[PDB]
Ligand binder design. Structure first.
Ligand SMILES: [Ca+2]
Ligand SMILES: [Ca+2]
Ligand SMILES: [Ca+2]
Lengths: 156, 67, 105
């Protein structure tokens, strides 16, 4: 569910990234490290018609703290913004059978490559590589039903 | 000579062996309609049985690997 | 990563985009498979002799009593599969922004 937000971050118009940087620079008005700590996220949340706790405040900082410095910087702030802007499990099961062509109950690399070529789009050696090691989260050359669910989180 | 066998075959006689040739016309029709509809239910029940053997097998794979 | 996550997501979306189409294609195949299995198993009616028209209506009546038993036997198999599927599934389960942008800028 993570690398679905970085895509939305990547496809932000530079006119959207401008408004966010502008709104981010008001956010951090008067912070030492120039970043959203708990004071900054505190004010703008309680003044946004809310009132979260100091503990509950950090779990929004740490939900997008890919730095660990308790402060949401601008790049983490874009991920925080796109997080608040999929496919049902019962429906993903019906499609899991379409991949598993030999009907064994797993999705090996060959079944993935056949679907990729059937997309009509030009597949590369590196598209196939990154996708398989993204879905196969224990490196057994195959994607069982439980991983395929994690693989298709939020995919339209 | 079975009691439940003689009575079973009598269901035809009580329902068919007694009346009109013009009603037998429009009664043999509805008798085929019932078979076709049941033959359709039997096709779909067979197809769902195929899909469940896949559903069950995928579960047997998951229950094993997740242990 | 060797590729952008924006492409990674664009490819994932196109994989389901055709897997859906293979499913609907599979449904159309199964629709044609049924009609063929129905013209074989349910040869439509056509006419007769009022006497020996009856022994077919008798034969149809006997067919219904057998067809529905065959339909029951396959149904009870689907029924027991539902019980095991739900039993098997039970075993494995154990193992704001836009409101902020306006109130800021
Ligand atoms: Ca940080
Ligand atoms: Ca397979
Ligand atoms: Ca795996």
């Amino acid at each position: 569910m993570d690398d679905i937000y970085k895509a939305a971050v990547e496809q932000l118009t530079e006119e959207q990234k401008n408004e966010f940087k502008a709104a981010f620079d008001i956010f951090v008005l008067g912070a030492e490290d120039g970043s959203i700590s708990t004071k900054e996220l505190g004010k703008v949340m309680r003044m946004l018609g809310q009132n979260p706790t100091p503990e509950e405040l950090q779990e929004m900082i740490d939900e997008v703290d890919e730095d660990g410095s308790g402060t949401v910087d601008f790049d983490e702030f874009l991920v925080m913004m796109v997080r608040s802007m999929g496919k049902s499990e019962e429906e993903l099961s019906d499609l899991f059978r379409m991949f598993d062509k030999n009907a064994d109950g797993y999705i090996d690399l060959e079944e993935l490559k056949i679907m990729l070529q059937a997309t009509g789009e030009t597949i590369t050696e590196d598209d196939i590589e990154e996708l398989m090691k993204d879905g196969d989260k224990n490196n057994d050359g195959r994607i069982d039903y439980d991983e395929f669910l994690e693989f298709m989180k939020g995919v339209e | 000579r079975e009691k439940k066998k003689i009575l079973a075959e009598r269901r035809k006689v009580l329902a068919i062996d007694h009346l009109n040739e013009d009603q037998l016309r429009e009664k043999a029709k509805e008798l085929w309609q019932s078979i076709y509809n049941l033959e359709a239910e039997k096709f779909d029940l067979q197809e769902k049985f195929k899909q469940q053997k896949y559903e069950i097998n995928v579960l047997r794979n998951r229950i094993n690997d997740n242990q | 990563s060797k590729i952008s996550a924006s492409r990674k997501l664009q490819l994932k979306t196109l994989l389901l985009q055709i897997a859906k189409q293979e499913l609907e294609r599979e449904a159309e195949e199964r629709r044609g498979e049924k009609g063929r299995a129905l013209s074989t198993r349910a040869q439509p009616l056509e006419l007769l002799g009022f006497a020996e028209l009856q022994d077919l209506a008798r034969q149809l009546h006997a067919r219904v009593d057998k067809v529905d038993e065959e339909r029951y036997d396959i149904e009870a198999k689907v029924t027991k599969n539902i019980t095991e599927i739900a039993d098997l599934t039970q075993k494995i389960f154990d193992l704001s922004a836009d409101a902020m942008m306006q109130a800021l800028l």
